[PDB]
Structure formats: C-alpha cells, structure tokens
Amino acid sequence: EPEPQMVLSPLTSAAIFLVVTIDSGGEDTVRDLLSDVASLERAVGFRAQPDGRLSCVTGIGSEAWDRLFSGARPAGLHPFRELDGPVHRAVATPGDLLFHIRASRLDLCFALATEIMGRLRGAVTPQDEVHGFKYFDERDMLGFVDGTENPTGAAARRAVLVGAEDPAFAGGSYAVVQKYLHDIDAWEGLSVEAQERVIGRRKMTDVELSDDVKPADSHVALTSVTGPDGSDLEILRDNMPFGSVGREEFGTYFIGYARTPEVTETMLERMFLGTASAPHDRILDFSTAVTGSLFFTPAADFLEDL
Amino acid sequence: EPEPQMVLSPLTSAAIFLVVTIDSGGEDTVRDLLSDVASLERAVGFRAQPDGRLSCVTGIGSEAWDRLFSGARPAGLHPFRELDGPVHRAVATPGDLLFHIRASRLDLCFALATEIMGRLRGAVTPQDEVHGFKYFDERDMLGFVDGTENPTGAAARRAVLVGAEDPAFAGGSYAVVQKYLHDIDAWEGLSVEAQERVIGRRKMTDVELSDDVKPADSHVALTSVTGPDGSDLEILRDNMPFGSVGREEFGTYFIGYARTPEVTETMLERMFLGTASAPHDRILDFSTAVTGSLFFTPAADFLEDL
Amino acid sequence: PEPQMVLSPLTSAAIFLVVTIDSGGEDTVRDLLSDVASLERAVGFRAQPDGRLSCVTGIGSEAWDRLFSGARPAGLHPFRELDGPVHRAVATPGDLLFHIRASRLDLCFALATEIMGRLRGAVTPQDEVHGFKYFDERDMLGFVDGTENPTGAAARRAVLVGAEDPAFAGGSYAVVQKYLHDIDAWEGLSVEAQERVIGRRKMTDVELSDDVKPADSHVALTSVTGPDGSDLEILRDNMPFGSVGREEFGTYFIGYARTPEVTETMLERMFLGTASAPHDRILDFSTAVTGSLFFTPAADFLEDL
Amino acid sequence: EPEPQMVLSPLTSAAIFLVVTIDSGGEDTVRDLLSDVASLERAVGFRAQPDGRLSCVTGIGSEAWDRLFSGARPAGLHPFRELDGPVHRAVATPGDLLFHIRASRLDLCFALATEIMGRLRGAVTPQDEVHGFKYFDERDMLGFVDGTENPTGAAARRAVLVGAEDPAFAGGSYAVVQKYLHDIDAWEGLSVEAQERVIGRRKMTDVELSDDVKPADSHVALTSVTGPDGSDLEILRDNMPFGSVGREEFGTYFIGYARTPEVTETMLERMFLGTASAPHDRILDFSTAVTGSLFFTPAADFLEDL
Amino acid sequence: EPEPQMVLSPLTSAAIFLVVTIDSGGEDTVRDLLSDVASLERAVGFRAQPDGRLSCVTGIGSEAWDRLFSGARPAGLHPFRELDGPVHRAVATPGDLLFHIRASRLDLCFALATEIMGRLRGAVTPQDEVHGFKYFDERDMLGFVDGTENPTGAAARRAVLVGAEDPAFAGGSYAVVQKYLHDIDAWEGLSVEAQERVIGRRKMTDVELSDDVKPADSHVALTSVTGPDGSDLEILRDNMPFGSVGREEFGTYFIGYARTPEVTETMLERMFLGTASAPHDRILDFSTAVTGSLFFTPAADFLEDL
Amino acid sequence: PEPQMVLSPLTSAAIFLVVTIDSGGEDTVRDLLSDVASLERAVGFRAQPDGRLSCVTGIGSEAWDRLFSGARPAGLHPFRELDGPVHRAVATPGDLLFHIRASRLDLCFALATEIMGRLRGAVTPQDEVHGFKYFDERDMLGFVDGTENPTGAAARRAVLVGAEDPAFAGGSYAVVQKYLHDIDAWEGLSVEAQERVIGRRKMTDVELSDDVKPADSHVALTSVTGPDGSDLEILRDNMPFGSVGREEFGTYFIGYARTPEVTETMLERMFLGTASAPHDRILDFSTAVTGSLFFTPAADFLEDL
Numbered sequence A, B, D, E: 001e002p003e004p005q006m007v008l009s010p011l012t013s014a015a016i017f018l019v020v021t022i023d024s025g026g027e028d029t030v031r032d033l034l035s036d037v038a039s040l041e042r043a044v045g046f047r048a049q050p051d052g053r054l055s056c057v058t059g060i061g062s063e064a065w066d067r068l069f070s071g072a073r074p075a076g077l078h079p080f081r082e083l084d085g086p087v088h089r090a091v092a093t094p095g096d097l098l099f100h101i102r103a104s105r106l107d108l109c110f111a112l113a114t115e116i117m118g119r120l121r122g123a124v125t126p127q128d129e130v131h132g133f134k135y136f137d138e139r140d141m142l143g144f145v146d147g148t149e150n151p152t153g154a155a156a157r158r159a160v161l162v163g164a165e166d167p168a169f170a171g172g173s174y175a176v177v178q179k180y181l182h183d184i185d186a187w188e189g190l191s192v193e194a195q196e197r198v199i200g201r202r203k204m205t206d207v208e209l210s211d212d213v214k215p216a217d218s219h220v221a222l223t224s225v226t227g228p229d230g231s232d233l234e235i236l237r238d239n240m241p242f243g244s245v246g247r248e249e250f251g252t253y254f255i256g257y258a259r260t261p262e263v264t265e266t267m268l269e270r271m272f273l274g275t276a277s278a279p280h281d282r283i284l285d286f287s288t289a290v291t292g293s294l295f296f297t298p299a300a301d302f303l304e305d306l
Numbered sequence C, F: 001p002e003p004q005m006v007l008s009p010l011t012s013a014a015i016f017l018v019v020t021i022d023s024g025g026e027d028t029v030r031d032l033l034s035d036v037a038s039l040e041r042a043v044g045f046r047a048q049p050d051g052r053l054s055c056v057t058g059i060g061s062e063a064w065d066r067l068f069s070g071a072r073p074a075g076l077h078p079f080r081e082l083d084g085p086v087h088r089a090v091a092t093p094g095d096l097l098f099h100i101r102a103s104r105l106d107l108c109f110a111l112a113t114e115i116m117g118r119l120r121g122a123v124t125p126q127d128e129v130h131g132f133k134y135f136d137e138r139d140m141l142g143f144v145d146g147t148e149n150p151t152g153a154a155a156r157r158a159v160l161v162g163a164e165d166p167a168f169a170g171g172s173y174a175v176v177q178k179y180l181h182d183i184d185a186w187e188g189l190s191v192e193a194q195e196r197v198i199g200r201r202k203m204t205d206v207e208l209s210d211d212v213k214p215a216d217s218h219v220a221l222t223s224v225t226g227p228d229g230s231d232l233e234i235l236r237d238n239m240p241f242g243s244v245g246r247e248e249f250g251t252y253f254i255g256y257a258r259t260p261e262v263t264e265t266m267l268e269r270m271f272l273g274t275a276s277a278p279h280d281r282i283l284d285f286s287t288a289v290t291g292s293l294f295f296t297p298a299a300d301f302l303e304d305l
C-alpha cells in the first residue's frame, strides 16, 4: 500500500511556497535531495510536536521529470498550458520543483525551507517564494471565506489521489499553482452586494447565494462543473493570502490538488475562456495571474526509494 | 461504506438541540432544507477551522418520514413508545425533525441554528430548544462524570451505525431524546455515599463500585444489559447539562444513538418499569422526563441526494 | 477603597441576574451581600489561572432605602423612563443586579447557583440572561461592539466614583437594558445602509469619516462632549443572547459610569433626539424590554455589612 | 478484530513508568486488576476530554506469564538477556508487570497510577517508578532531540504490532525498558562538535549528519540495522527524561516497542558489544543502564477477557 | 524603594522546592551565586516568554545568615521552633538555603535548578528536593481545593512584606516550609461529610461551612486568627502536591509567606498544641510533618548588591 | 501624559514600515497621525483578548519640522552615519516609522493596510519588513535574543523621556537598522567560537563568566556604564526576517531609549571599537543596510493634532 505525501492535510496558519528550476547539471544533486526531503521534514518537525503540524509536499514538473527519470512517467504529467482568453490570460511560467511547506508557525516552515535550499544551492535557480498567512476567519484578500467547499474524508481521497488508473503512481496527485495579485482599490469600490455577485456567496456569513440570484459569470457558478456521474467535479484548494502593503501587493496564492489535471484544467478553461452564458469569471476582473505551473506530487515512498 | 452523519463524534463544550414539527403544507420547504443542511454546516463551520468542531446531525421522526418520503422506510423507525411505570412515566412528545448541533463554542452552534431556522420559518413550529454547556470535568447536574462508558473506535461503529441488516439505510442511526429536569433540593439532601449508590460509581473519582456493593436498582446496574450472546448492548450518549437558575431548572438533555432503537428501548424499559430485582431506576426519583422522541438520522448521502 | 471588578474586560460568557427583594427578605439579602466575595473565591479559585470569574453586585435606589439606614450615593435614583415620540425606554423592577462573567459558562452558572441558593424565599427573579461571545466581538446586528470603550487610566476616571462623593469612592453606576432586535427588518438593509445606521464600517470596524457619518447614526448620537470639550465616556460590557425558535436575537446592554448623568444624557439623545436627529436609527431595529439602574459599591462596603 | 493497546500513540508531555513484581499468592488479585485496567483508564481519562490524552499500556514479563496464564505463550517472550560487554553492561533486573502511563498532564497519570496500585496493594512489590517530563523541544538530558526517526503510520504498525507470525497474539507488542543515568559532567566537557559525533546528528537543528561525516561508532550508525532484504528494522521509542538535581541524577527512561524482541536485541548487541569498525556505542561512555526488563503487551481484548 | 522577590506571585502548575545546607568553607561560593540568581532566572526564563512564568524565590536560614553576612539581621529570623504536642510534633530539620522555583512547566524549573546547583556543587549538601504538580482543579492530596482564602492585592502586600517595623529589611518576607505526608488509607475511610468537618469546607464545591456547623477543631477554624486590634492575621500559601505511588507517598509541600514568623508560628501552635476548645487540628490525624524550616527571603536588591 | 506602547513585550509577529513624506503630503500625514490610535483600536478590538495588537508611530528629524511648529524634542536629529575602518553604520531616508506588533500577522497586516490606505499618494515606502518569532526567542544567528532587556521600573527609566525635556515627557527615541547576516561564514565557526563572539552560551543562554568573556564580544562591547556608575540600558524589540531564495537572513534591529545618546554610544563602540577591541565581532557576520532615527511622541501628543 503506497503512502501519499500530506496532500490531504488541512489548511494551516502559515505556509511557504517555493518554486525553483533545475540548472543544467543539477539533476544528481536534486535526486539526492528528493530522497532526503522526508528526513529533513522529520528533523525539523519533531521539535514542535504536538502542535507544530509541519508538512512538506514536493512536486515535480513535466520537463523536470523527463530530465530526472529514465523510467515510467505519470500518465497526466504535462507542462501547464497557457490560456489566452480575449481579455484575461493564464500565463505559464517556469518551474521544475515545488515545495509546499505548511505549519502552525512560520518559523518551522522557514527552518525547513532553509535546510532544503541549503542542499540545492548551486543546482537550482529560485523562481518564486511566497510566505502565506491566515487572514482572520479563513478569509482571502478579497474578504471572503476561502476553502469552504473543499472535499473531506473519503470524497477527498477519491478526488485527489491517483489510483488504479495509473497504478505505478498510485498515491500521487497533481498540483496546479498560480500566484494571483488583486486590484484591491477597484474591489473596495464595489458594494458588498456587488462583491457577493462576483463570488456567488454571502460575504460575512459565507452562505451560498440561491440558484435564482447567483449570476452565471460568478466564480462559484463557473467553477461548479457537473461530471459524467452528475456529481460535481472536485479539487482540494490550499490557497493562502500574502502581500506587501508598501508595494500595494495583495495576493492569493492558488494551489489546487486533483487526481487528474483534467479537472483543474476544465475549471481554468471555464474561468478564462468562458461559457455560452458567461464571457469569463468576474473574479478575474479583480485578479491577475502572474505565475502558472503544474506539478506531480508522487507517493512518499517513490521519493524515498530513488 | 456510505458516509454517516457525525453520530460517532465526541462530546463538545457547547450544543444546541432543536426539535420542530412540520406544519401542514410545509413538506416541500423542509425537503429543500434537508438537501442543503450539509452545505449550511460547511458555510458556518469552515470559518472556525481548526478548533471550531462544528457538526450538525439531522434526524427525522416516523410520522414525518411518511409525510416526506414514499417507498422505503428504515426498518426500526416508529414513534417513541410511552412507558407508564407504576411511579414514573417516560412521556412521548411531538417532534418531526431533530437538529443536534455541537461545537467548541456556542456562537457557531447559534449561527448554524439561525441559518437552519431562517430557511424553515413559516413551515415548522418549534417544540424544544436547549442550549447545553459543559459542566466542569464532564459532569452532569447531579455532579457525576457523565459519558464514561461510551464505546469508542470500532466498538462504537458496531453499536451505532446501521449495517447489513438494513442495507439501503446503512450508515444511518437512531437517536432517542429526552429532556430531564432534576430535583436538586432532594438530591442534595442525600449524602455523597447515598448518591453513589443511586448512580453506581464514586462521585469524585468516577470509579465504578464493585459488584458486591453496587445496588440492583442503581442506574449503572439497570442500564448494563447483555445480549442473548452475552455481549454488552451499548449506546452512544451525548448528554449535556442545561438550566436556568432563577427558575430552579437544572437539567440533563439525554440523547442516545444506537444501530437499532430496540437497545435504547430495552434500557428505558428496565429503568421505568424495572426488573424482578429492582422496581425502577433510583435516578428517576430525582429526574423527571418532560420530552421523549425518536428519530432516524440518515446517512449523509441520503439527505444530499433530496 | 478597593472597587469591585467593574474595570475588568469583556469575557466569552456571562450571566446577568436581576431580582427584586421580597418584603421580609432584607436580612437574608444583607447576609448574602456580606458573603458574595467569599462565594466568588470559592468557585473561582478552582479555575485558576484562566477561569477569569468575577461578579459585580449592584443595588437599586428603592432597595437601598430598604437595606441601609445611612447616607445614599449622590447619583442613586430609579431608572428614568424616557417616552420619545416613537421609541420608549421602559423602566422595569430590579433591586439587585449580579453581573457574572468568566471564560466559561459553567463557572458563571455555578456561582449563580450558589447566590440564588442563599436567596431562595427572599427574592423573586426578574430577569436572567446567559450571554455568549459572537465571533470577533460582534453583536447580533453583525457589528464589532465595544471598540471605543476607555482603557487604563481613562477607564478609571470615567467609571469609578471619586472625591465628589467620598463615602462612596470606588463605586460605580450600572445601567442595564435588555434589547431585542428585529433581524428580519435589519437584514433587509444593504450593508452600506446598516453602516449609516451605526456609523462604522461593518466588516473592518473602521469609523466612518465625519463628513459621511449621518447625524442620526448611533456613534454620532452617543458621542458626547462635556462643557470643557472633553469626551464623556462609559464602559460597556454588552453581550449577545438569544433563542432561535422564539426568533429572539438580543443585546444585553450594561454600561458603567462614575455618574448616571453621563449614561442618561446618551439615552436622552438616543430616544428623544437632538435638533439634528429625531432619534437614534439603531432604535428602529432594537426594542428595550427592561431598564434598571444600580449602584455597585466598593468591595469593602459589602464585606463590612 | 484484534484491538491493540495504545502502543502506537505519540509522545506526551508527562509519563509515569511503574514496574512491579508479583508476590507469591498475588496472582488472582493481579488477574482481576488486569481485567479492569481499561475500565480504570476510562474512569480517570474521561474527566479530561478532549486534551488529557491519558493512556495506559500494560506489559507482562516472561516468568509472570507462566504464573498467571495456562495455554499458549507469545513466541518471543523470554527474560531480558544480560549483555556483558568488555566495558559496559546491560543489566537484567526484576519486573513482572509494566504500566506505561502517559498524558498531557502529570495529575492524570498520577491519579490512574494511584487507582492501579490501590487495587494491587498486598499482591505486588514495586521495583521502579519514574515520573518523566518533556524537556524543551523534545530533548533528552544530553541536549539532543530524541525520537525523530520513529516510524509513523503504516510503517509503525508493521514495525510494532504482532501479526500473522503469531496469530493468537496478533495486536500485541514487545516492550524493552532500560533506565539510564547520565554522567553530565563528562558530557558537558565535550565540545558540541564532539557530542554530535557521538550521536550522529546536529545538536541544535536535529539534522542528521551525512553518511561521510557520520562516525561508524555514532549512536545513530549503530542503531541503524538493515534486515536480509536491505530494509531497515525499526522500533518505536517513547523515551522520557527524568531526574533529581540534588542527587545529580539526570536520566533517560528508555522504552522501545517492537513486533519482535530480536530487533531491539540486535540494536542492543551492536551498542554494548560493537562491530568490526566500532568497539561499542560512544553514548554508553556517558550513560549507565541500571534496569533492564522485557515485557509482552497483549491486545486489549486479551486483557478484557479474563 | 526596595523591590521584593516574587513572593506575591500566584500558584503555578509546576514547582521545585530545593533545600540545601552550606558546607563548611562554602560561604564564598554561595555569596557569588546569590548575586547571580536573578541573572540565571532571566537566562532560562526569557526562552519561554510569554507563558513560561518562571520565578525563583531564595531564602536564607538563621544560622546561615550569620555565616554569610555581618551587621544587622532581620528582626524575626530564628531557627524553626519544634512543637512537641501531646500527640503530634512539628519537627525542625536542617536547611540553610531555600530555592522556591515555579513555572508553568517543569522543564523550566528543572533547567533553572540545574544551573543553580551547578554553581553550588561542592559547597552545599542537598537536604530536600520536591517536584510539585497541580492536581485537578487546584486540589491537594486530601481531595480539597487548597489556596482559596489566600489574600490578594493590597491585602497580600500588607500580610507578606516587611515594612516599617523593620526598615533595614523592608521588602523581605519569612517563609516556613514543612513537608507533609498523608495517610490516605485512613482518610478514605472517612465519609465525605466527616472529611468536610475536618477541613471546614464542602469538598466538591469548596464553599465554606456555616459558622453553626463548622467544628472548633476543624482546620479552617484553627488557622483563622485575629490579632489584639481585631484584624485578621493572614499568610500566603503556595502549597503543592507531590508523591510517589509505589512508596505510598502522598504529600502536601507546605510553604507559607508572612511579614513576621509570629503569624505563621501562632497558627502552627494552634494546630499542634491546640486551644481551649480543641486538642489539636484534626488534619494532623491524617498528615505527618517530616521537615520544618524557616527562611528569610530578602528584597531582590539585597541579593544583587552582594 | 500617556506613552505609546514602547514598553510592551516582544510578540510573535511584527511589521516594520518606514516611509518618506512626498511633496505636499503633510496635511494627509497629520490627519492620519491624529487617527492612528483609533485605527489600532478598530482592528485590535476584534481579537480580544489574545491579539495583543499595538502600533508605535515615530517621526524623523526633518519631518518634524515639516509637520509641526513650536518646540522640537531636544535629542531629535538625523541618524549619524558611522564610517568605521572596516564596518559602516549607514544612514538611509525615513520620515515616519510604524512599528506594528501582534500575536498574529493578520492583525499587523490589517492595521498596516488601513494606515497605508490613508497615506496613498502622500508617502513613498522605503522599507517594509515582516518579522517572525524564531523558536525560543532566537535570532538568525541561533542565539536567544532580548534576555537583558530592562523590565518594570528600570525599563520606564531607561526608555521614557522625563523632566529633562518636559514638553515631550512620555516620548522615546527609536533607532532602526536592518541587518543581513552572512550565515555561511557564521556556520563555518564552531559553537564555541560563536559563543565567544556573542558572550553567552548558545543553547542555554547563560552569560560567559568574566574570566572567559572576550573584550570584543558583543555583550562586552554593548555593556556601557554612565558616570553615575550606572548601566546604560536600551529596550530592543528586534525580530528575525528573511527570504530563503534570496539567501536573506536578517535581524531587524529596533532599540528604544530615553535619549539617542545611549544608543549612539553603543553604536560607536560596536563600529569604531574601544582601546581593547577594534570593533564588535558580530559585525563580521552582520551588515547594516538601513539606518534611521525617530522620536515616538506620547500618545496624547498625536491625539491632540
């Protein structure tokens, strides 16, 4: 039975997202770090038990996989595809390795990130680093509760973990990341009621708008997709706020896990390219994506054994 | 396995119990809310991750079931059976829907109860509303630790959840509720030692009395029942204190979950009607039941699917 | 002169008990008053350090005359009914107030049980409210409630009797009103409309600009300057309460001040209005169902009965 | 169907370790106690839900097994084997019953130990009693983080619980205990760098030394044992610090659980008897074992059915 | 303005009490350590801000005072006075220095005690070391809440601190310590009602018994003392439970602070020698004193100015 | 005179914001200064009782003259650059300092958002640092940091302006410097060598004895006596910060004192050395990249604008 990485674990109060590219000739140094990353997580994490809640999920991109490994490859692993809508675009930016580090305190995340980057220095080039923080009662920088409809329990396992469809990679998952910056000045000019129509839920109480008032181009309408079984396709989102007040940077770091990239991609196509009933997701009128990458997060034992 | 509601979840520090009857003509409104209640739970509950521990268990009575649904019925669902003992009576009182709401804080329970009732206004009449609170080290209003011998783990699952005996309803449970008021002035007139003999356990330390000293009419003796096989029949109790000091109202809200009502009903018969060895449970000389209702709590997917 | 715990902060749980003293019950009450500090310690010590149990005991004007034979606090009088053109602040019976707070309801309940156990047969209960914290210090209107309370030395100056009434130094005056809200009407307003009623932004609790704040907003009417241009302050320990089945959504108002004049001036502005404002808009969504005034003596006064 | 005792549970901030021998004629008293131990744990532990985390693991030694039970014995149950190295000795000391009591607070541990010993008064003689406490960020008295490489999850179940190889005792485990006292004066005369070389991990950060700096006589190198197939053999350690400053007693109470004693014994052999490259584990130059006992901890249901 | 040591601080969940005698020739080493104890406390304590709550109060006995210092001595500093009652005795045992160490966690107490004793090795001989722990809801080993009637605020300052009656030593205090062991077997043979009559308060609820039913040989009656001017004489008690279950040692470590030893001695005389209406305190029928020492705890600046 | 929260303890989160005031920005700034206590309460009240939000506002020497007429604080001047033979304490621009602390970053960030929202178009940001607690009060060098800060009466005497400048009593002076560390070089030292640089034991935080403590150790050089025979003390609220990808491992130094002369004396000793030490060894591993000096007025001074 393969052991997944901590892709099912809940939101925490602190996170570091690190994305790097592998320099020419850095492959061996990377493979050696990948075999040790669980050890490094325990080394730091055990110090803060029982309430540290440190974890690290490590992901590998498509191009990187092809450089690192001469054997089998996950069936759905491909580069993130840029989506160039009429107005808004989902950019594809470089990234070979993802480290999604979470804990109840930033120090633990920073200590682990330090140890990882110490072992990769000279073999990789940093592309992005974000230090995320919880904002009040699980809110995002738009002021809405963010994560409510994430799946839990068995539904989450079914939605997130690779299974018998790709048995060599059972227990893995697919992560899509996008860094979004928000136009807070424009957003704060809307009434609360107008903001609710953009999102599709009530702002203070987090209750969904009824079907007969929710606009077709609201975020919740466009990211609600019925599957063949009539169910509703699900992903697990671990989005975190970030920002810098002096630079007027108010951000949402989007990370979504799914058993196949097709689910996440379908949602992105609906948001950016629109539907018959909606030109594009109105959240994008206040949000700009500035990164976009796709990674496979293998089973823990995959990493330990290479 | 089907996904149960949160019937196996532990005691919390705050609860709201709401029992309502469905008005004539209110059935469609109720069905629509039933299909939404999990959504509403997540709407409020996600705000307080990770410590809020909000849950809501929804139950449906026997008469209401036939008004709401055609076709299949759970095998054990029937109206609560009034027990008229020589001295003490377990009354049957009206109740179509139960909402058992728990959290670590009363605000979450109140917020959810507000949303539920807002969606039911004009379609239901409230019958009972109790706001329960933890009392010191898991004590009840009689001053005894209350919940000790609840089953845990796999034993709890076997005792509480419908299984292969009624497969279309697997993952459901049966809840019996009774609101009890205590005669605290008479109770406080007993010595500690006399109270221990009523209950069957030591007051301060919660250790069970030895079998040579435990009276036949003690509460623990009468609610310990073996199956024909010789296993204990267990139920899961989530009893909470409640009260009002000005009205001299000191209560225990009894709620017990079981895989079939027959177990809870056997215990109630022993308590109210007695055995050859005991006329009745001595706890009832200090405890008056003022409500009594029976509900089936379906698996979560039953409610989601309408 | 050691005060009662009138300066202490909001807690997550509270019980408010108001009783009247039955004829013949005076001696029982005096014995309880002398023991209430003892009872508080008896329960509270169990939950060190984080129980934060306290009890503030208040005595009304009528009761004072029945219990005590000496001087009266200078500002003590029965709550004055205010009959506005539209809204009324009712005066309701109440001789003794127990304002019980802790971080957990069980401590409040255990202490109230002990107090009422000593008083049974001597007092009649008039009101009992079990208050609870609602999210991030919100009230049932969905606004943060308590923000502009004074702190530190400013609170002491605003709340405690001093040299103006030296026999009663260290006391305070408490005004209580139980309010029920019409939540259906309130939820019919847009958020921005609700902000104009209160005078602060709903989600972030930032005060509206002086040039945008309506004259009949709550914050505008309860902001009062004394003749010297200094702000008149009170200390509020309001708690939410309610019952969903009865559609009871409430604010239990309690405010402490050094003299009732300050609290009364605010009530007059709210219910009777000014030249600018007919009445406080908050009252279009809030009905007062009780109204009582109490003096909360220094702790030593009760101990020396 | 076999329910383990709580041998897989995590470290806690408080523990009591109690070892007793059974007096001639005390066998019936002990059997009666063993059948009630779970009941005593619930009696005390329920008082401190949800954060008390009280558990008790009960172990039975080789000689005691034969005096208490007739029938099958566990395959691996024998007396602790003394190891007489050239310099350092692993002593064998008496012990029939082990009670490993853990909680987040010492009071809960002490209250349960009181109830257990109250029932055993007259039937047993105490041999050892240690009250353990968490020291900073999971450090031992040598100043190093202690516990880091314990297995978790499925790997822990595989390393610790008896299975198909001894099916009558499935769900049990073997515990080895050793009380160590440290020579802190000698230890504190080593540089940090020298201490790191004794242990094989960085002191402050708990990061493992790489294979090339890691001495072959370091504690980590000697307790790293690979089985026939190239796989690590693992144990689960719940060691706790203890001490008395006035008597200069600074100790580590060692307790290690494993599915077979052979794993734990091999590690001990490497420590005390050494390898081709290492005469003995350098940790023992600063640590003296003053007790040594081996116990079988049965499945919970085994104890209940007495 | 003399700054006192932390003698007015509240009870904590953990404590270490250390009593040592000063070896002949150890005086200079002890003086140096006295001058550094505040420094050492800061060094350990700062690591656990804001919740560590570490403090250390240092006391010096009468005989030691005269070995360490020259000049004027505190007015009430004498050796503990043995009380030989008809039935029970308050023994006097050796002790030159007291370290009363408190914190919210034992590790902090132990770390500080290690540092202190490290500086004193070879200059002192340990006499007593007790590790105290909070027991449920501020209970003692007799099962009663213990500390309720301690003075607070200005009343505590007035009861505890030396003032103008001995102005050279203003800001100091006197500490009496006695280690008590209890006869729990005898105690548990009493009914709860009989135990209440021994103490003078209700067991479970901690409410004081009425004047009419409170016995005259009850503990609370005998330790309630008024002076000639009608004022209540008070002390501040920081008692902690301690024990060892195997040795059947169930203890109260008594420590009481007062501005003159005469108050504490008057209570001890009433307890051990009795009054007109009571032969002795009934609590002593279940409690034996095994140590007895008196210390002066100087103002902080006195120590620093060494 | 009520001080700002300059005596308050370290917290787990902090934001340090330094801005300069643009052409014509003075009126906007003055209006925000008069409101900053109000904004602090607006946000902070939401997180009672655990949030521990505070904001200390400082004003630089040049900005003082732009914003206010009348008296200046006696000790206010531009930060003095120190060009040592090897190491330099640089001066960089800064008109306003906001030192924001809480138990959680969200509270800091919310307050900083509201402040900057009011200052948009009036100020240019110079520096923004988000500090976090690192294990048991450690800095990025791995040492416990803050141990010897004064407390209680000693801290009030060391930090608050008094009768020496009575118009400004209750104020203080803050020096800030952002330091970046050469962690690769530092980690090249043994623990024992690092202890000799700092002057305390690394794991246990106990001070080295006078026998063993080097004269160019940090603790030696920053222990300064005044003629009074008195230790000169400052109150430090430094916080770690950093970025792993940029190899940025920092200490944000902020030190409060009743006069800048104390802090400047320690800076001189560190950067320029003494008869017995060329410079503080900590500077061989630490580079200052900002330096600014501010006066933090009493709270009532800001309120009164």
Ligand code: HEM
Binding pocket: C139, C141, C143, C144, C145, C146, C147, C148, C149, C177, C179, C198, C200, C218, C219, C222, C223, C234, C251, C253, C255, C263, C266, C267, C282, C286
């Ligand atoms: C329906 C009952 C009430 C509700 C729901 C309510 C709610 C609020 C809210 C949300 C605020 C703004 C935040 C704050 O500073 O606390 C506020 C402010 C205030 N309220 Fe009320 N309040 C009520 C009744 C009263 C009454 C009866 C009085 C006085 C007799 C009063 C006096 C104040 C004062 C003095 C302020 C602070 C104004 C300032 O200086 O900005 N309130 N109240």
Ligand code: HEM
Binding pocket: D140, D142, D144, D145, D146, D147, D148, D149, D150, D178, D180, D199, D201, D219, D220, D223, D224, D235, D252, D254, D256, D264, D267, D268, D283, D287
């Ligand atoms: C003086 C008594 C002991 C002390 C202070 C001690 C301390 C430590 C420390 C600090 C570590 C490194 C961190 C960790 O993974 O836990 C360690 C690892 C370990 N210890 Fe010990 N230990 C002691 C006795 C023992 C004994 C008696 C055994 C086995 C019989 C044992 C088995 C192990 C094992 C299996 C590991 C993990 C090694 C690895 O795979 O990396 N220890 N111990």
Ligand code: HEM
Binding pocket: E140, E142, E144, E145, E146, E147, E148, E149, E150, E178, E180, E199, E201, E219, E220, E223, E224, E235, E252, E254, E256, E264, E267, E268, E283, E287
């Ligand atoms: C033998 C072990 C002792 C135990 C277990 C014990 C226990 C208690 C208990 C349960 C109380 C009532 C609650 C409270 O107010 O703290 C109490 C009160 C008190 N005890 Fe003791 N005590 C002991 C020894 C002493 C000694 C030796 C002294 C004095 C020399 C003392 C002085 C007091 C005082 C002054 C009170 C408060 C009485 C009042 O004013 O109500 N106790 N103690």
Ligand code: HEM
Binding pocket: F139, F141, F143, F144, F145, F146, F147, F148, F149, F179, F198, F200, F218, F219, F222, F223, F234, F251, F253, F255, F263, F266, F267, F282, F286
């Ligand atoms: C460069 C980054 C700095 C770091 C990492 C650092 C670190 C430390 C450390 C670890 C201590 C010992 C523990 C303590 O008492 O806090 C210390 C003490 C001290 N530091 Fe620094 N420090 C820095 C810069 C400064 C600066 C710039 C000043 C003054 C202008 C200063 C003044 C002090 C003082 C006054 C003490 C206390 C010395 C004593 O009385 O024992 N520090 N610092």
